[PDB]
Ligand binder design. Structure first.
Ligand code: CLA
Ligand code: CLA
Ligand code: CLA
Ligand code: CLA
Ligand code: CLA
Ligand code: CLA
Ligand code: CLA
Ligand code: CLA
Ligand SMILES: CC1=C(/C=C/C(C)=C/C=C/C(C)=C/C=C/C=C(C)/C=C/C=C(C)/C=C/C2=C(C)CCCC2(C)C)C(C)(C)CCC1
Ligand SMILES: CC1=C(C/C=C(/C)CCC[C@H](C)CCC[C@H](C)CCCC(C)C)C(=O)c2ccccc2C1=O
Ligand code: SF4
Ligand code: SF4
Lengths: 141, 81, 61, 728, 73, 37
């Protein structure tokens, strides 16, 4: 947290901005409150805070858990999409329904993405995620 | 002018001979497949480079090709002046 | 490898090389390309049907 | 009865089966309307056109009534009523959430929102609008009429559809429309004007208690107040029964000029105008032959006009004008476009509404809007002309006619045309850059303005002059000149100019000449595609093959871009240039020596200071002395309450470069990249069944040109919008 | 950044801060940031090495007044 | 009848539906507690 960066608590220009900090929304405490919420980080001569990313508990949670949340949701959406696609093909109405979504079937697949990570891990160990270099017949060259 | 290239995949539908407006093809007698008469280029000198012919070739990896040469002339360039 | 069997292709320049199609009609005449196979994946204008010499085909199952 | 929509491709037999690849999507949005490409029948076509017209009218009514309603409940009209100067109209109040809270366009009286520029209140300063409830009723009427005529379209298509001979009575068409539509509507609007408009206008001179001013019902049968003014307007004295019209000199007069108490002209002139037009084209539209065995046999008129150079004249032209549709489409589009641009070129010297020349914001917005639409659609008129040429013609009914006589000697025409274009082009631009070099070369005596080598457009000066002293002799019963840019006195109000005479010195010459230059080359491209549409000296199968196709192989070298709509591509690029520099010129002059402020001496202190006589002669000056002013605030024009609208000019450049990306590149490259990504996806078992395929080259060209135009026009409107906000 | 600053509040906008180049900078021997590592630590194992005339090099690099590995953001 | 969904399920109309759902989703959390940083 070095590099010549003053704490946002005691950076004079920080509170100087905080004084007439333009309260954005329809509540008078909007601006001031957020500046109060910006005492944990450490400002600089620009008067605005920089973010440190190291796992260092000074700013660890301020970047780690959002990353993990994104991984959660991206895994969910990718998993349910792939599962839906795999399911459609066992109907022999393939491209008919490619544009007409079968809602009574599209729902439970979406609702059943609860345990995507570890299940995916299983498909990794079972090897249920990849087809074989030559079995996949998509010809290169 | 330019060079023409023939192959074996000529099924013999003869859509190319009806497509070339430049009279550079003819179906010479063959024996191999049910065609019995395969296309060929007897009159290359009037080639134009439009290559509307292979677009009329339905065969997988269309049976005719044209190797577009470099010895062009007033005929191969097609000028009325 | 008979009429109605799924086989992959040995012809190199083929658009569906190594891809599996069904033997629609087993011809065996004097033509160099007897076997008529049908696919569903589309090359130029959908030539999902084609002919080969059955010395260029191998079954899967 | 809802079992029918979700069956796509209902109109085409080919794309109705199924979406093999993504291509099936694209054509879905491409052939949804050209139902001439569906059958050979015509009654169906006509019925479809009727229903589509009804739908367009319905959306018209909807949007106008909704805009009213916004004007009633969220617009500071009735406060801006009492003061149209010290208040700037607005609408579309900002919604108070994160992101749009600082954008409160406060225009006095605490009314926040969005400071609009479309001058509807100006109409609402002439229509005499007091309370918003009547306006509420107006919107209700508009929307109910919309729904009504939509239902009418449904009925006239599904239950009782018209027959086929109902089409080609152009005679009754012209008669009914010309007379009944135009004359009756115009005379009705004039009657509304005289009854209500000028009365409340009178009543808007000194603060005469607007809402307290009576309602029209207080004047339907109450002639007393109507007898207050205009003594002849007791009832009317009805001297028309006695054929005497001298009594009516009260309201139905002829002034012809600026009325410095209204910010516009004298409305009585407009009323008498509308009267005269009404009866004039009523008796006009009573011309052609119809069901009473009396009139012109119009297909014989064109038969008569022939002669030595004519060949056989205008013989055989009606099969074209009625059997085919694209013809009519193209011609009417061209005419409308021209008409619209003259309208634009018209209503900045004769403001026909109250508070127009005094309101220096709505003027150029309206001007440029209409001007852009004009060209933007006349090119389409020419395109439909070409599509007629490829779709509809006849070798039999077109023997030696004035039509055929040009298609036989096209080469001379177009060669001489190219000649003219080259001549004018460098004769103007190379002259310009010559003077540029001279100024950069310490040889200033070789410049071309008044202070140097001379040239003076005497013709415009003399025509303006002979226009200056028109009244009295040419116009005895006329009081003031038609405008004040030709001649007269500098008419104004406050410290704010309304109209002064315009000066034409030296810089006018090359500007008008390059205008003509670009118009010439535009015509060149379009007409070239027109004539060389069916047969070229090398391609004799064009019409035998179509008019929308990319190329004809690498024969004869290259042949790419040999269709016609690529000709109109190039043409639309060029017309973009034309109209862009045209609006540049107009804005700069009418902000340089026409507009500014005024002192008690009538001293017009213009905005810029007459910069054409100083810099509008060399190129480097043209960038300096125009866009320095046109942007020096947009950089900082953001950052407060009535500034926060960070404009998407910074944003439009991106779409412009993204545009030009599509132009310079082929497609096979993208196809191969697509195939590689497909390989990867197939390796991870996510291969989309519908196999993606790259765009077709014509599709890519279209999206490129679309994005190009969009970015450019967005950029420029952002420019002068913020520029006017800096002064208005 | 563009939209957030386009609302008048710049504090709602992200600022990253590179530190890998900072670490390599100090680790070459820069003291500005005071990490005491590898010629910022004048007592490490390699703190008696480098050039056999590293004092002048140190006077130079410490004098970052010239164009010698300027700070970043 | 309920056949309307048979003719309302097209994809495009469903696209905008899902996108607007997710949009108001993103709004309410930005509308209810836009004060957590
Ligand atoms: C012509 C097309 C058109 C367009 C583009 C708009 C556009 C708009 N209208 Mg609108 N409106 C229209 C026609 C139109 N209207 C018509 C015909 C009526 C009369 C029935 C209304 C009545 C109306 C009301 C009563 C309100 C809007 C509002 C709005 C704004 C937010 C829309 C919203 O959340 O729904 C409307 C949301 C609610 C009513 C809640 C938006 C600028 C809202 C706004 O911001 O005020 C201007 C609003 O309160 N409109
Ligand atoms: C990206 C987030 C976001 C969201 C969800 C909104 C949401 C809204 N804006 Mg908005 N706005 C944003 C960012 C955003 N704004 C930004 C970054 C700017 C530039 C600083 C603006 C500038 C802006 C203006 C100038 C206006 C809005 C308006 C609106 C409202 C109607 C427009 C609408 O939602 O679509 C259309 C939806 C319907 C018509 C229903 C709505 C509450 C309008 C408003 O408040 O009145 C309606 C309006 O006039 N916005
Ligand atoms: C959320 C975006 C949004 C929306 C929905 C509108 C909607 C509208 N604006 Mg608007 N405007 C916007 C952003 C927006 N504006 C921004 C960012 C600016 C610049 C600050 C303006 C500046 C502006 C002016 C100056 C004027 C309008 C006008 C209008 C109305 C004309 C309708 C129209 O253009 O139909 C087409 C629909 C679209 C273009 C969308 C309409 C209610 C005009 C008006 O109120 O006329 C009475 C008018 O004069 N607007
Ligand atoms: C005096 C009688 C009269 C009047 C006033 C009209 C008026 C009109 N006719 Mg019409 N017509 C008439 C007699 C009349 N017709 C007769 C006798 C025939 C038979 C030959 C036709 C056959 C006819 C056709 C075939 C079409 C019209 C159309 C139209 C509309 C043109 C669009 C327009 O004006 O935008 C007005 C816009 C606003 C007010 C906004 C207009 C409402 C066109 C249409 O469909 O309407 C859109 C059209 O295609 N007319
Ligand atoms: C009232 C005006 C009007 C009308 C009714 C039409 C109608 C038509 N135009 Mg058109 N056009 C117009 C103005 C108009 N245009 C203008 C102003 C221009 C110049 C910008 C063009 C430029 C133009 C081109 C370049 C083409 C058309 C085409 C077409 C036809 C197919 C359109 C379609 O289904 O779109 C479906 C596609 C989208 C909606 C996208 C259709 C008959 C196409 C044609 O030839 O079809 C016969 C065509 O290629 N138009
Ligand atoms: C640097 C920009 C630039 C310049 C200087 C020119 C110059 C020219 N173009 Mg041009 N052009 C340009 C960009 C440019 N173009 C772009 C970007 C496009 C695509 C939108 C075109 C599309 C185009 C077409 C389609 C045509 C021209 C034509 C012409 C010629 C007009 C004759 C003339 O006045 O000579 C200028 C001499 C000097 C400046 C010296 C001229 C050689 C026309 C032509 O052949 O006219 C005879 C013609 O048909 N050009
Ligand atoms: C395209 C229009 C155009 C026109 C009308 C002129 C006209 C003129 N130039 Mg000029 N010039 C031009 C373009 C043009 N220039 C361009 C594009 C350049 C390149 C930068 C120059 C560079 C140039 C130089 C360097 C000089 C002139 C000179 C002259 C003058 C001598 C006339 C002469 O010898 O004509 C002869 C005509 C025929 C034989 C026929 C004359 C006024 C001379 C002059 O008087 O100084 C201004 C001179 O020294 N010009
Ligand atoms: C990539 C890292 C790195 C680099 C570029 C250098 C570079 C250098 N070291 Mg060095 N060193 C390093 C890591 C590094 N060291 C580490 C991790 C250690 C601990 C084991 C040492 C221990 C070390 C000693 C003990 C000596 C050097 C010396 C030197 C210099 C002579 C060339 C050489 O030995 O290499 C040269 C400037 C020599 C030197 O210049 O001494 C005068 C020398 O004697 N180094
Ligand atoms: C330009 C424009 C516009 C506008 C438009 C207009 C403004 C129009 C007008 C229109 C009109 C203005 C119309 C009107 C009409 C009217 C009429 C057509 C009338 C008729 C009448 C009659 C028919 C009568 C009848 C009767 C009676 C009533 C009584 C008894 C007797 C009788 C029977 C005779 C808009 C914005 C949209 C868009 C953009 C552009
Ligand atoms: C990019 C590009 C392509 C790539 C081809 C395609 C089809 C790219 C199109 C990608 C999709 C169709 C764009 C979708 C735009 C949407 C904003 C994406 C939203 C999708 C999610 C929201 C679901 C060409 O094929 C091409 C051909 C000839 C000249 C120039 C070009 C060219 O510039
Ligand atoms: S090349 Fe094509 S058209 Fe010619 S014979 Fe062979 S299959 Fe027929
Ligand atoms: S370009 Fe093609 S069609 Fe034309 S002559 Fe050559 S081979 Fe024949």
């Amino acid at each position: 947290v070095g590099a010549g960066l003053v704490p946002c608590s005691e950076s004079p220009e920080f509170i100087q901005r905080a004084a007439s900090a333009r309260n954005t929304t329809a509540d008078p405490n909007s601006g001031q409150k957020r500046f109060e919420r910006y005492a944990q980080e450490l400002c600089g001569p620009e008067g605005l805070p920089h973010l440190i990313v190291d796992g260092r508990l000074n700013h660890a949670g301020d970047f780690l858990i959002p990353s993990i949340l994104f991984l959660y949701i991206a895994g969910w959406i990718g998993w349910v999409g792939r599962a839906y696609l795999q399911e459609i093909k066992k109907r022999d109405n393939t491209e008919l329904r490619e544009v007409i979504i079968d809602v009574p079937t599209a729902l439970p697949l979406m609702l059943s993405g609860f345990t995507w990570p570890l299940a995916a891990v299983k498909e990794l160990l079972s090897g249920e995620l990849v087809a074989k270099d030559d079995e996949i017949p998509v010809s290169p060259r | 002018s330019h060079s023409v290239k023939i192959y074996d995949t000529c099924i013999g539908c003869t859509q190319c001979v009806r497509a070339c407006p430049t009279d550079v093809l003819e179906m010479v007698p063959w024996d191999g497949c049910k065609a019995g008469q395969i296309a060929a280029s007897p009159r290359t000198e009037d080639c134009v480079g439009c290559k509307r012919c292979e677009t009329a070739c339905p065969t997988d990896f269309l049976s005719i090709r044209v190797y577009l040469s470099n010895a062009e002339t007033t005929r191969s360039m097609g000028l009325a002046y | 490898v008979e009429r109605g069997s799924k086989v992959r292709i040995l012809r190199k320049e083929s658009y569906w090389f190594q891809d599996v199609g069904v033997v629609a009609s087993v011809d065996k005449s004097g033509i160099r390309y007897p076997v008529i196979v049908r696919f569903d994946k589309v090359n130029y204008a959908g030539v999902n049907t084609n002919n080969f010499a059955e010395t260029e085909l191998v079954e899967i199952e | 009865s809802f079992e029918k929509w979700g069956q796509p491709g209902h109109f085409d037999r080919t794309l109705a089966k199924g979406p093999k690849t993504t291509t099936w999507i694209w054509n879905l949005h491409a052939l949804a309307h050209d139902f001439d490409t569906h059958t050979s029948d015509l009654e169906d076509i006509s019925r479809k056109i009727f229903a589509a017209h009804f739908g367009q009218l319905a959306v018209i009514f909807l949007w106008l009534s909704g805009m009213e309603f916004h004007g009633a409940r969220f617009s500071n009209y009735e406060a801006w009523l009492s003061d149209p100067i010290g208040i700037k109209p607005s609408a579309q109040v900002v919604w108070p959430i994160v992101g749009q809270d600082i954008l409160n366009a406060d225009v006095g009286g605490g009314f926040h929102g969005i400071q609009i520029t479309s001058g509807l209140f100006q109409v609402w300063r002439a229509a005499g609008f007091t309370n918003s409830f009547q306006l509420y009723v107006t919107a209700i009427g508009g929307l109910v009429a919309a729904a009504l005529m939509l239902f009418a379209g449904w009925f006239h298509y599904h239950k009782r559809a018209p027959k086929l001979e109902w089409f080609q009575n152009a005679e009754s068409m012209l008669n009914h429309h010309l007379a009944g539509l135009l004359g009756l509507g115009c005379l009705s609007w004039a009657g509304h004007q005289i009854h209500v408009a000028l009365p409340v206008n009178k009543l808007l001179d000194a603060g005469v208690a607007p809402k307290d001013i009576p309602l029209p019902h207080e004047f339907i049968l109450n002639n007393s107040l109507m007898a207050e003014l205009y003594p002849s307007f007791a009832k009317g004295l009805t001297p028309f029964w006695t054929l005497n019209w001298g009594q009516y000199a009260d309201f139905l007069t002829f002034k012809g000029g600026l009325n410095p108490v209204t910010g516009g002209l004298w409305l009585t002139d407009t009323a008498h105008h509308h009267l005269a037009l009404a009866v004039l084209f009523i008796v006009a539209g009573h011309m052609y032959r119809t069901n009473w065995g009396i009139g012109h046999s119009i297909k014989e008129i064109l038969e008569n006009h022939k002669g030595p150079f004519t060949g056989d004249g205008h013989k055989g032209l009606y099969e074209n004008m009625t059997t085919s549709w694209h013809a009519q489409l193209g011609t009417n589009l061209a005419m409308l476009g021209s008409l619209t641009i003259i309208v634009a070129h018209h209503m900045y010297a004769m403001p026909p509404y109250p508070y127009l020349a005094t309101d220096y914001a709505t003027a150029l917005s309206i001007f440029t809007h209409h001007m852009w639409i004009g060209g933007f659609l006349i090119v389409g008129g020419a395109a439909h002309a070409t599509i007629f040429m490829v779709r509809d013609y006849d070798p039999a009914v077109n023997q030696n006619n004035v039509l055929d006589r040009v298609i036989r000697h096209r080469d001379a025409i177009i060669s001489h045309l190219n000649w003219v274009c080259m001549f004018l082009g460098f004769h103007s631009f190379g002259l310009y850059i010559h003077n540029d070099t001279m100024q950069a070369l310490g040889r200033p005596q070789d410049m071309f303005s008044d202070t140097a080598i001379q040239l003076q457009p005497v013709f415009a000066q003399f025509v303006q002059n002979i226009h200056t002293l028109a009244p009295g002799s040419t116009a005895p019963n006329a009081l003031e000149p038609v405008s004040y840019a030709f001649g007269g006195g500098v008419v104004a109000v406050g410290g704010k100019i309304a109209m002064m005479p315009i000066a034409l010195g030296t810089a006018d010459f090359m500007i008008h000449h390059i205008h003509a230059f670009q118009i010439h080359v535009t015509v060149l491209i379009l007409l070239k595609g027109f004539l060389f549409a069916r047969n070229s000296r090398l391609i004799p199968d064009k019409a035998n093959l179509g008019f929308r196709f990319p190329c004809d192989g690498p024969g004869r070298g290259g042949t790419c871009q040999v269709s016609g709509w690529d000709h109109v591509f190039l043409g639309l690029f060029w017309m973009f240039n034309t109209i862009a520099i045209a609006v540049y010129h107009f804005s700069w002059k009418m902000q340089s020596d026409v507009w500014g402020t005024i002192d008690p001496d009538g001293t017009i202190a213009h905005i810029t200071g007459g910069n054409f006589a100083m810099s509008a002669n060399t190129i480097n000056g043209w960038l300096r002395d125009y866009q320095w002013a046109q942007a020096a605030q947009v950089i900082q024009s953001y950052g407060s309450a009535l500034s926060a609208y960070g404009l998407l000019f910074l944003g439009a450049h991106f779409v412009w470069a993204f545009s030009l990306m599509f132009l310079f590149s082929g497609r096979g490259y993208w196809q191969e990249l697509i195939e590689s990504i497909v390989w990867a996806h197939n390796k991870l078992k996510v291969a989309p069944t519908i196999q993606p395929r790259a765009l077709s080259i014509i599709q890519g060209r279209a999206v490129g040109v679309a994005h190009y135009l969009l970015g450019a026009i967005v950029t420029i409107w952002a420019f002068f919008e913020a520029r006017i906000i800096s002064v208005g | 950044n563009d939209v957030v600053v386009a609302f008048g509040t710049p504090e709602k906008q992200i600022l990253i801060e590179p530190v890998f180049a900072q670490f390599i900078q100090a680790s070459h021997g820069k003291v500005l940031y005071g990490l005491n590592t590898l010629l910022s630590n004048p007592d490490s194992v390699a703190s008696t090495a480098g050039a056999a005339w590293l004092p002048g090099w140190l006077d130079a690099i410490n004098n970052g007044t010239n164009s010698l590995f300027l700070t970043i953001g | 009848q309920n056949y309307l969904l048979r003719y309302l399920s097209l994809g495009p109309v469903l696209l905008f539906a899902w996108l607007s759902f997710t949009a108001v989703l993103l709004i309410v959390f930005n509308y209810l507690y836009p004060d957590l940083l």
